[PDB]
């Protein structure tokens, strides 16, 4: 049993809810919240901008030190950093950004990072301002992630479309 509430069950291990991931993280304090990161960990907008704002920019400060030491992530890659006031840990995962021309096949590699964590609160990778089709992102998620993933979808209209079209 875990503390996630109000989710629709899509499969054995994937659950979904119309929710603001920031508010959901603040209430659950999950072990892992996933950020929709870019390779530079520049958390300017979308999910990343919202998560970072909720940490009062502490996420960005920590991220800048990480990049100064380690250099950029790979598209499809990830790193584990602090969850600050939102979670124990934040898994920063880089989905391909279609608006940068990045190969959508890397979306599966991005979701594979979730398998290193038994339970996660996450957004749909490469959705929103990353330009991919969220229906496709949900399909890749379901077909790739084997650990228990709680997906937060901010837009109610999109949430309803994702549920109604799910196979
Ligand atoms: O419906 C979805 O989940 C969806 C559609 S596009 C996309 C990526 C961009 N997300 C955001 O800008 C975003 C900003 C927030 N500010 C406060 N809480 C937020 C949650 C967010 F998700 N997510």
Curated annotation (Swiss-Prot):
Start and end residues of each Macro domain: 1-167
Activity control summary: Inhibited in vitro by GRL-0617.
Membrane topology listed for this record: Multi-pass membrane protein
Reactions catalysed: Thiol-dependent hydrolysis of ester, thioester, amide, peptide and isopeptide bonds formed by the C-terminal Gly of ubiquitin (a 76-residue protein attached to proteins as an intracellular targeting signal)
Subcellular location: Host endoplasmic reticulum membrane
Domain of life: Viruses
Subunit note: May form homohexamers. Interacts with N protein.
Entry function: Responsible for the cleavages located at the N-terminus of the replicase polyprotein. Participates together with nsp4 in the assembly of virally-induced cytoplasmic double-membrane vesicles necessary for viral replication. Antagonizes innate immune induction of type I interferon by blocking the phosphorylation, dimerization and subsequent nuclear translocation of host IRF3. Also prevents host NF-kappa-B signaling. In addition, PL-PRO possesses a deubiquitinating/deISGylating activity and processes both 'Lys-48'- and 'Lys-63'-linked polyubiquitin chains from cellular substrates.
Name used for this protein in its record: Papain-like protease nsp3
Naturally occurring in which organism (per UniProt): Severe acute respiratory syndrome coronavirus 2 (2019-nCoV)
Lineage, top ranks: Viruses, Riboviria, Orthornavirae, Pisuviricota, Pisoniviricetes
Included range, full protein: 1025 to 1191 of 7096
């Amino acid at each position: 049993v875990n503390s996630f509430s109000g989710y629709l069950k899509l499969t054995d291990n994937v659950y979904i809810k119309n929710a603001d991931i920031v508010e959901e993280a603040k209430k659950v304090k999950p072990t892992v919240v996933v950020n929709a990161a870019n390779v530079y960990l520049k958390h300017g907008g979308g999910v990343a901008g919202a998560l970072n704002k909720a940490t009062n920019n502490a996420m960005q400060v920590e991220s800048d030190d990480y990049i100064a030491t380690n250099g950029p992530l790979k598209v499809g890659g990830s790193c584990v950093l602090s969850g600050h006031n939102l979670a124990k840990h934040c898994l920063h995962v880089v989905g391909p950004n279609v608006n940068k021309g990045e190969d959508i096949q890397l979306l599966k590699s991005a979701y594979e990072n979730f398998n290193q964590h038994e339970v996660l609160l996450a957004p749909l990778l490469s959705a929103g301002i990353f330009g991919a089709d969220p229906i496709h992102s949900l399909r890749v998620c379901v077909d790739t992630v084997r650990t228990n993933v709680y997906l937060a979808v901010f837009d109610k209209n999109l949430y309803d479309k994702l549920v109604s079209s799910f196979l």
